[PDB]
Amino acid sequence: AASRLDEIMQRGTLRVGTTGDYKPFSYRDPDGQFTGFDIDMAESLAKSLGVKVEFVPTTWPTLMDDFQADKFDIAMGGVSVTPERQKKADFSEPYMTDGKTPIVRCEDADKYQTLEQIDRPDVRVVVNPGGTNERFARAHLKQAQITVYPDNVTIFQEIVAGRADVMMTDAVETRYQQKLHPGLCAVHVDKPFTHSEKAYLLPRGDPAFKAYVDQWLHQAMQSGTYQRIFDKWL
Ligand SMILES: [Cl-]
């Protein structure tokens, strides 16, 4: 019945679900430390509340089930607002805009500027399984050969090696991957095919907790805190 704010204050810690697999938002290094834009934002929210932060590992396939099992109070780590997630959770106000856009071999940058160019019988589109990327590919590709590749790290090497031609993912991810792989280039990264918003996942039916988060976030956007963290990571 009581707000999660009460439980957080009594416990003395804010439990933050995060995947640790999405630079620059959230990454868990071998030593077990989390770093990234949303790790720093989580520390700022916890500081506002006067509590310690505890990072709770989750994964994209288990995010919602873990949240419903009360494994954490809020999820922070490059999470897009989606209608599917809104059935089971609320969201904070958004903290940045994103969208899906291609990443290709640099020599192919001009070949794959539009979906009409990509959606052709001989184009080999690769995608990671089970999430918003595969949903996007299957909703927008009627002719291209879609291959699902299971390894979320080595998938980009499929394009480098010439086993695939295009992958469409979050524009922020294409920025990171085109720096990591010199042979790949993000396609019109400032004008993605879709418009999405990143936000923090919150429990339904707790307007007080959501209002606290929204107020902290609005203050951070105008105080210099957001600017500093954004400049460090994005
Ligand atoms: Cl995905």
Residue numbers in the entry: 12 to 245
Copy out sentences from the published article reporting this entry, exactly as the authors wrote them:
We previously used ancestral sequence reconstruction to show that the trimeric CDT from Pseudomonas aeruginosa (PaCDT) plausibly evolved from a monomeric cationic amino acid-binding protein ancestor (AncCDT-1) via a series of intermediates (AncCDT-2 to AncCDT-5)40.
To better understand how the mutations along this evolutionary trajectory affect activity, we also solved a 1.49 Å X-ray crystal structure of AncCDT-5, which shares 15/15 residues in the active/substrate-binding site with PaCDT. Since these active/binding sites are identical, the ~15-fold decrease in KM and ~5-fold increase in kcat of the dehydratase activity must be attributed to amino acid substitutions that are outside of the binding site. Beginning from this closed state, we again performed triplicate 500 ns MD simulations after removing the HEPES molecule. Likewise, AncCDT-5 displayed the most prominent distance-distribution peak at ~5.4 nm. The combination of the DEER, crystallographic and MD data for the experiments performed on AncCDT-3 and AncCDT-5 suggest that both proteins predominantly access a wide-open state in solution.
